[model samples]
Target chain A: SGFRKMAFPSGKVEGCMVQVTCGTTTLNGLWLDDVVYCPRHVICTSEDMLNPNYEDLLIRKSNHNFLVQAGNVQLRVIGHSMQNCVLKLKVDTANPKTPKYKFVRIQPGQTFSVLACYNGSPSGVYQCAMRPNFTIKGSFLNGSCGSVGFNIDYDCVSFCYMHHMELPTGVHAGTDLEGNFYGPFVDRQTAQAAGTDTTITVNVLAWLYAAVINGDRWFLNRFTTTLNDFNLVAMKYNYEPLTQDHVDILGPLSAQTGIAVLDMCASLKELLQNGMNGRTILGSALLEDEFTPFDVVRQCSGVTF
Target chain B: SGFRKMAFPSGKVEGCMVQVTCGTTTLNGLWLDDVVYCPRHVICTSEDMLNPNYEDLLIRKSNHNFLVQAGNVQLRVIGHSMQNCVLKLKVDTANPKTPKYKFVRIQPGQTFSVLACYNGSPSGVYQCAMRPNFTIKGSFLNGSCGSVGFNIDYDCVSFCYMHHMELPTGVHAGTDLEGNFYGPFVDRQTAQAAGTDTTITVNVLAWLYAAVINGDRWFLNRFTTTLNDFNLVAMKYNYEPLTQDHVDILGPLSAQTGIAVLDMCASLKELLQNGMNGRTILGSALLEDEFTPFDVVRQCSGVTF
Candidate 1:
């Protein structure tokens, strides 16, 4: 019987316009960030509380709370949120610049990477937390909390360029140290669904810089992981892998793929020597200035092409 | 038969250690190159004319016949000679410390890339026409005309680093401007047959420098020839290729694999700018002095891993 009177909120009905209404009890002045958890509540009235004709923002929280995660250019919500609380999220159609809309069914525990969303508010406001102009990962975001209202998490997995980052496959779709993401394409098909260039850039280059790097064993770890996935690149492109007899005539793994690796190394040398625009070949932390990505990559990993 | 006297070589009673004999006639002044075309019973005293039992030399003449090719340590008469007269070549592999032999095989009509051989007597006797010394792609001519006996057209396309200068594969393997050769590997098996390191050095270092260099379109060409091949490098190593829906989404051949190419380009720039050890990335003719096969390759190609 001693639930301590439920620690009721006491801010009087003053200037701040947000409030909560339940049966005969009405509480005012609580902002979205200040709300407490309680079983007796049904909804929070969040619109301009003073405008008598104001459509109150009574947010009905579902058993499962919803939040977003982002990386690279994509943003997604996790579907494993414990309980089913689906939201009929209306979203922007395709390109964010000039958007179209569609109702996105973010079903219970159903998460997805987002595409089009808010650029910014159409120019009005409620009393609190206007959720103004925002940007997503690799991309700047905006919102009155606008179209398709999905802007907060751009760092989620995506096969597309999302923001400006090229995330590699094999590493699974997740955020990078630099805060980018790449979808882990299980097969060429999952990616091909987006199209060729999408998967190629998604898989090859993303890995080239992040996963492999000339200095980084050319993503050799992929071979140690899923050789079939590794081989999928060539299969997708219709090319062949390097074959060799390593250490013996019958099973010799010649120190060289006869010369393919060495040859690639030589080309690498040339690329370093002449390909760059008069850039010096040394000293940068990584992704610093116009050439850090290269600096890190130049001396990254540990294998020849 | 108007055989114009068949040019039966004449002249005898000499002290020179070389001679030719036929029917009831003998010519002491004639050499393999001096004989005219004619089906005649004959013999060129090769080992030593003075030895009488010397069997010095007896070369069957072809219609202006000839040839010589060299590399990876073996020399040969191009069997492709218009008339595969295929002389029962008697070679003196006797030069061990210093070489001495005649019949460079490069006859009046023969053209080839030979390390060394006789210009037919420079006008001389057998004792010293031995030209007692030589160096091949990676060997030296001994009195046995050995080791340095590097010979044969390099294009006999086996993957082993054959010294006859099996240059590269993209060019499709035949003869080079320098008259050297390279056989296109139909696949790995055929090359493993002759079993020399011809194609290894050929493709490796050459492509290493050419295929990838900034000035060189090595990798570029590989991409052009086989975006498939380009994709294979990753696939061969079990990595994926670049993927992205670039420029346009339909029937789109994205110029670059979105960010992948750019990312790698940046890395290439870094390698050129900040990774090298200050080697003036310019002109050093192929295999310039001091750099033998490996020397040329060692200094010629490059690195990142």
Candidate 2:
């Protein structure tokens, strides 16, 4: 299939800059200068900088072998190969920690390859230090030596490692920055999920509102279906008789909102079945529990049950 | 009115101990022992050591205050005396960094008083070691005598000054040890009182339940009345509808729990009214300045014109 262009939401660039690089020695320093002022702070000088060199440079020494490549440096020194090291490679421009270097010994006439990796922190400059150091004596520089620059591809490994990062789990009940309840539910899914618990204890006002508007029914159903999946039964209904004064005050306005006396049993059954938990019944443990009877009689009452 | 015998709830005591002191010398020794164990650790002996004298005086100085007391010697050094003296207090009770001391200097002629305050970290004993030590000069023999026994009762100050003394706010919500929602209003009142701009947001379930039960009307009435009094009109209500199928299942059960949907609204209003802003019609500047009328209207849909 041909690549399809993905449209992104529109927004201002605010600022933009570009960089260019050539050879082992930086040619057009303008690229580095532009990177310094890029609105995003860190700009790649070249696609080569974006890639990590992970070549395994194996060297036979007597009866043992040593991998002298840049990727094997962490493993050789720290006793653990960096599995997700490529993702960690970046161009740290700020480079808070001063970089220090020491001379390393290499066997004479031994062929070696250079692997470069970048460390991106405050900026991308920190990555420039990881370029491999190599030396070769005599013998026509045959096996992978005397070469200054090489492009290595380790993008897939980094991307694959990041793919497994698990997202955190918890209810994202929407709270304002100050963490106050704003609405019935932040989203429909959260509302539905909230009803999985058989019994929900809400502030008195919230409970009353749920009763009248039939909002609790939604969550109850979700809870039953998703968490319990238990067959519900209803037994009794008690209505708090509304006084004439209440009717006189609220009656005229009732039409606007379609307020009605709650049918307790119907509301309960509806809430249990269709509420948030109701939709979750298919996968609920209550349905699978052997102790609970599938045909239990469901009971409902207005009075405290 | 005569003092009435107070009745208190009874429970089995897990641990309890009693001690007796006779004569001034014994009392002084007992007081020293109490000082050692009263705040953090208990230094109890099988029997009271008569005229117990501490050979190795351990004095502790914290924040430029010395804590020292002589139990056997009737040394009464007045205020401003014994200023520069080294005293050792206990350390390593929990950690060595936190040390406790019992020796304190008496301000010349100032009634000997020991102030005990815990700045929260680990509890420690403080001894007041007065500077410019004054030898007993008056009366019997005029020898090197500091008044041995003296009693003055000022309020005992057990101040915990450490950062860990106070509980993180919001952690106090829900039932305390006695099982009561300590505050009817949760975060709303706290934020408002703290001069923070906060919106009173409530769960829709709570709002609906309150409306249904009509119990929340009282809260709404109060809230609206307060808002009206304040001459502020910005408020919003949001009513997101749930599927009838969902409501049908959960409604009856919630209704039976005496959880009317409108009750939620009532509770929220109650929280707003009783919250930090006080029982005022006008909302706090924080809330009024931040929220708009449309926001209130959107969140609270059933408001009558």
Candidate 3:
């Protein structure tokens, strides 16, 4: 027979929570509730689970999935000055096609729970881009924003889905007043694995962005050429071809990257000669034309006229 | 109706004499009676006429004869070791062909007078060449004897002969034993005037000498052709022509003298072409040849051999 479904009778294994201590005082707490696990154990439920000790609440699962009670997962956001402010939460997943996630508007001194769900099957890495809108005296400002982007390997979970299904019958995981289930829970190992993958993806993307900004076409070309062999995903944004101006800047960058500018230019020329109709190449040509205008200007200015 | 004779007496001029003084005591008294002067006044007294101070005496007669007496004419020779040495005195003025003047040679501390009787009219600059022989001996050396040649020029003098019997008589102005005389005499002025007439002649002779040394017939032909008024002098010496070896050394000397081997050779060729007899032309040629050989030998020996 297949292994019996695992269960957390005390509702503690449903979510991941960390107590944030600032100078020996617990200032705030964070909880990740939608954790997915293997279909082997059942989630816990009891009044004593409402305030479970941290050590006793530690949970583990082999398949990175579980069920959780909503009331057991809490978020306490402390505000230093302004009162009567609305709080918003947003979640992002690795799948660009489906980026929406669940959140709730919270007031100061209020507690909230989320039915967090995450897929255990590896699907690259995911990161959340969060932006909070603040209204001061009716003047709205996107006060703060953060983004986490990373890569996921085969060993980590990537996709997640939250449901409003509540626990039924004996020893079942329960829900809160908001009708949100806490989780199909994941453990520390899964969270860490996911975090590491995300970090890797973010770092790779950051490096690519840096290369482009620095006009490192040689690097971009090399990266693209190398990636063609591995089925790497393309970026979601539109990319333009490098112009001659871009090449001029990238020429030095290429040298810094141990790439000779002549070789890069030659290689790119060959690629253009061939039928590689990539935007980067066109961009490079445009940049070259841009520099040509400057050259003409210089020549004209140098004349006595 | 001849030149008037005037007399002006300068009273007895003291000779060069020294009185030795040491420790407030006179040890020795030395007198030099070699000084001579022209007598400006003639005295008729027998003592004045017979016992005249010859150091201050000069006589001239109408016969172009002159008598001069110089007292204590000292000739002090410094030997190799700085030792004072004496020489003998000689006077021979009897021969009309080669009239000689008197010379006094002193021995270490000995002194003597000088006297001369000249029978002809003195003119021009007269040079006396003295050849003194000295012998040296020492410990590590056997004997080294050599003669030193010295040349001295006497001052000019003027004399009027009252007795014209082939020599002059009467009072006159003449040189003293010290080679000091009166007047850039009338004869000197006359000689200098005569010198101008021979300047070009001497220059031609110098050119002839230069020509004979360098045996270039073509150059000589050009020179003769160019010098329309060339007056060739009679050749004085017979010698061989200079060879290339001779020119190697004399070439530089020729340049210094504003002459060159080629020019000399050219001049010689011209001389040969100008109906010059072989012996006379060859004699000058040979002298030039000798100069070349001498120059070569001097160069080889690092001296004027």
Candidate 4:
């Protein structure tokens, strides 16, 4: 009932048997369609409903359609577009040049399914190009749908990537809420749409901790990076050129505040060594200590003339 | 056999030494520890439980230190934050210049890691500055235990990233089983948490009905995505507004449909012909059918509110 008008470009579209070898005795329970369609396809011959066989489903292009699978995976284009479009399925470069083909014919709007599978070495890359009227431009898309190596517990068909811009030019972050030098918080176009002035800070520690609690090894590395990027280690003097990052900003700033060289000989023996004759804390004292991050500005302004 | 407690602040009240330096002599099982304290200052010598080598480890302000690893490798700190705030050891600009710094100094208790690898020509940036107080906000504790990037093969010291969302801007997807929409079939989070949505009827030919056969290719694309994202998607969609996806809502759904697109195609061809031939079969049978998606809502009469 919910079907489209069939456009038969050729032969009599009839009630016919398509040859499918599942090595089965097609018993009952399957129907192609009451209206002359594969709509009746699965109804009767689904002796095994969940594992029903559709290997021989028909697809139409310029001349003909091939079976979806026979030996290995393959690619086919049911050319329906007015302009000639070529399909290229380049398997992973794993085995150098085992199988290679450049062009395929595909027409638009119509669906031409190809038989494609993952390769061992290079995984795969796919690209499409159209002649005359327009060529979609660019390069081949990396065809690695999932874990390409070493992982054994899964079978993956595709993976989606959400795009993001790198932290601006000559920089390391989106923008800071306070200063212009460098920072971890990122600004957003939607900060306006989000209806709040709040920009997003890459809350590293929070995300890192979460990665651990969850044991997601992938995010764990991210945990390290957010920390590396967000850590405030050095900066330029207000007068320095903006792009000169290698210049030692912290070295000089710390020099001006210079908290004396360690009185090493006297300091260590007194505080760190515990009664272990070694340095173990008493089970009783599970006390917490604090490490303060000082304000260079406050200390500096305090040192005026 | 080798583990110890963490310490906080200046070395003076110190009988403690932080253990580091992976014991290689991977020999007689040793570690870096047993020192008087950093207070003992490297300017002199650190005598204790540790191997006290790695003279390059002592980093402080004003009192400078640089470790030039020839053949290639090095540590240079510009020092920006208090609490000895320092950012060090960066890679990926693939250049001698990048991994450049603006600033990095951090307080204890937080860990933030970013998958930062990749740098362009003129690809160098770094920064840092002071904090108002000393609050490195939040609950996550520092959680990284390696030099970032430059990892090797066997231990997988190396791997790279594929891609992210533009942040207009967020996402994931997956499995397949079917119908046609721009359409397909699906289930609910609970379909249960979905409780009573007597509204949409999955008009079979549109979903599971479609999966029994013809939709496998479209659906395979569906499976990889479904497994990965279901495997966290849609959860991000409540009122997030749609348009934001080149993503699907299932992995298992498509997987079930992965039931076999060709299998269905072949079986249908075998059952549908009243009088069939080979090109009709292998002569390359060119058959075509379009499955349209329909909404089955038993028109609810106006409860005219």
Q: Tens-digit lDDT track for model 2 on A1-305?
A: 00001110000000011121112211111111111111010121234233423223111111111111221121121111112111111232322221121112221111111111111000000000110111111011111111111111111100000000000122212211121222233211221233221121111112322223322223222221211111223211111222334334333323433533122223334543443331322112111111101001100111000
Candidate 4 wrongly placed segments (more than 4 Å) = A1-305, B1-141, B145-237, B243-305
- Tens digit per residue, CA lDDT, model 3, A1-305: 00000100101111122222222122111133322111110222233234433234223321112222122343233221111111111112111222222334321111111112222111011111111111100100010001011111111212221111111110112122132222332211122111100111221222233333334444335422332212122121112233344446444334445654444443433433342342332112111211122222221122110
DockQ, every prediction:
0.01, 0.01, 0.00, 0.01
Q: What is the DockQ of candidate 2?
A: 0.01
Q: Report candidate 3's interface RMSD in Å.
A: 70.4
Worst 10 residues of 2 chain B by lDDT: B7-16
TM-score (0 to 1) of chain B for each candidate:
0.21, 0.18, 0.22, 0.18
Ten-residue stretch with the least lDDT total in model 2 chain A: A120-129
Which parts of model 1 are misplaced by more than 4 Å? A1-305, B1-86, B91-93, B96-280, B284-305
Error of 4 at B6 (Å): 36
| RMSD from true fold, candidate 1 | 32.3
Per-candidate count of clashing residue pairs (backbone under 3 Å) = 108, 189, 80, 118
Error of 3 at A187 (Å): 99
Task: List the candidates ranked by TM-score, beginning with the highest.
Answer: 2, 4, 1, 3
Q: Which digits, one per residue and each the tens of the lDDT, describe model 3 over residues B1-305?
A: 00000010000001111112212221111112321112221211224433444323322121112122222232221211101111111222211222122333321111111111111110001111110111000000000001111111121111211110000211122222222222222211112111111111222323344333323222344442111222223222222233345356454546545655555545644553453432333112122211222222222222200
CA lDDT of every candidate: 0.20, 0.19, 0.22, 0.17
lDDT of 2 by residue, B11-53 (tens): 0000000111212211111122122111110111223222212
State the lDDT of candidate 1 residue by residue for B171-190, as single tens digits: 11112212222333221112
Write the number of the candidate with greater TM-score, choosing between 2 and 3: 2
